[PDB]
Design a protein around this ligand. Structure first.
Ligand SMILES: O=c1[nH]c(=O)n([C@H]2C[C@H]3O[C@](c4ccccc4)(P(=O)(O)O)OC[C@H]3O2)cc1/C=C/CP(=O)(O)O
Ligand SMILES: O=c1[nH]c(=O)n([C@H]2C[C@H]3O[C@](c4ccccc4)(P(=O)(O)O)OC[C@H]3O2)cc1/C=C/CP(=O)(O)O
Ligand SMILES: [K+]
Ligand SMILES: [K+]
Ligand SMILES: [Mg+2]
Ligand SMILES: [Mg+2]
Lengths: 197, 197
């Protein structure tokens, strides 16, 4: 709730919305005779790069899944994500924004992201959405995001990046003092509190 | 062009895209027997508030114009806006973002804004779009925006707000040392240069 309040940026894909599980389900359904990558075997952020190494033409097939209508809208929430962010947003002196990078193909993705937030968080939460391909230009105390490398036009972002665990990043050793949020069952309140006055 | 580079946030509606002229044209076409507000007579940011005072029911009719499909996509560029922002983005040590607040009705507006940027600035400029209802949380040196009151979660934004003239704001006296950009024919380079090292 508004105050300066602690400000927390929460990524959407891979943190609130299950991009990896939604991708794999739809990929197997559309392309049942192709090999695939089980979630536990995912390595590196870019799904299409790993699929491309697996078999020729598979990167293009992977791309076709996230470019399809309803891909973003039908993503399931990660366990605990909706409950956690609703609680977080209700805390005194705590402003939460959903800070999400849309894909370059804009026909469906931006729309569906707004629709997804309305569905799980309600109309009033639409005010908290920030769509950007550059998260470094958004100022905050924290950014909770599963991508290891968050870069852009601002060389010294104001936020601390807390790495949200995903299969693709779970084995990565981080440079101290970088830290993680393992899942929404993990103690996110303690991380927020560590940044408060 | 990227470097820290000077960072300039450029509003879309009322700065790049002619919201006021597009509104009036479509309003008169859809509601030809209703009274309207000539552009020179516009006062205050909120179109529907002025229309509402004019005749009962007119606020709802005004709303219906911007909620309609193709309202945002069919807005015309302001004179000089496309040429100015293309030149600005090409300057050394200058990063330009289009920082735009979408309407709450999300069915068409976000999509159409991406489509509009692709149309006038090209695919590569889609990387520079930031959609947010809170511009105070976006850090930059400058924000060029026609709204007089730009507020949100950050009480001390990093940017200087340069007020872009519109009919609705043209008579407003600003508190020194606030300043204006009168139009894209005005000397925007001098304003950028005043913020450089
Ligand atoms: O987690 C992801 N995993 C993944 O495999 N992809 C796919 C979709 C498509 O996304 C992109 C992409 C790059 C940068 C930002 C957002 C999206 P695209 O360049 O095709 O749009 O990159 C190549 C493709 O990789 C994107 C993402 C993006 C997440 C957005 P986030 O960082 O805000 O959570
Ligand atoms: O210039 C405008 N003039 C105007 O009359 N309106 C209308 C459309 C609709 O927009 C809103 C609005 C409020 C705040 C941010 C963006 C949009 P909405 O609350 O209905 O979405 O407000 C009431 C309505 O007023 C919006 C704008 C918004 C511009 C967005 P910007 O500040 O990024 O240029
Ligand atoms: K990082
Ligand atoms: K202001
Ligand atoms: Mg992510
Ligand atoms: Mg404006």
């Amino acid at each position: 709730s508004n105050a300066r309040a602690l400000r927390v940026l929460v990524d959407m894909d891979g943190v609130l919305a299950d991009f990896e599980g939604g991708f794999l389900r739809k990929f197997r359904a559309r392309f049942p005779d192709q090999p695939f990558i089980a979630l536990e075997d995912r390595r590196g952020f870019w799904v299409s790069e790993q699929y491309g190494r697996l078999r020729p033409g598979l990167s293009e097939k992977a791309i076709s899944i996230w470019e399809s209508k309803n891909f973003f809208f039908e993503l399931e929430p990660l366990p605990g994500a909706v409950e956690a962010v609703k609680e977080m947003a209700s805390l005194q002196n705590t402003d939460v924004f959903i800070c999400t990078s849309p894909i370059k193909m804009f026909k469906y993705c931006p729309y569906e992201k707004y629709a997804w937030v309305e569905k799980y968080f309600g109309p009033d939460f639409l005010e908290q959405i920030v769509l950007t391909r550059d998260k470094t230009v958004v100022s905050a105390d924290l950014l909770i995001d599963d991508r290891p490398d968050i870069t852009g036009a601002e060389p010294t972002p104001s936020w601390e990046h807390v790495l949200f665990t995903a299969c693709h990043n779970q084995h990565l050793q981080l440079q101290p003092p970088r830290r993680r949020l393992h899942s929404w069952a993990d103690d996110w309140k303690a991380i927020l509190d560590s940044k408060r006055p």
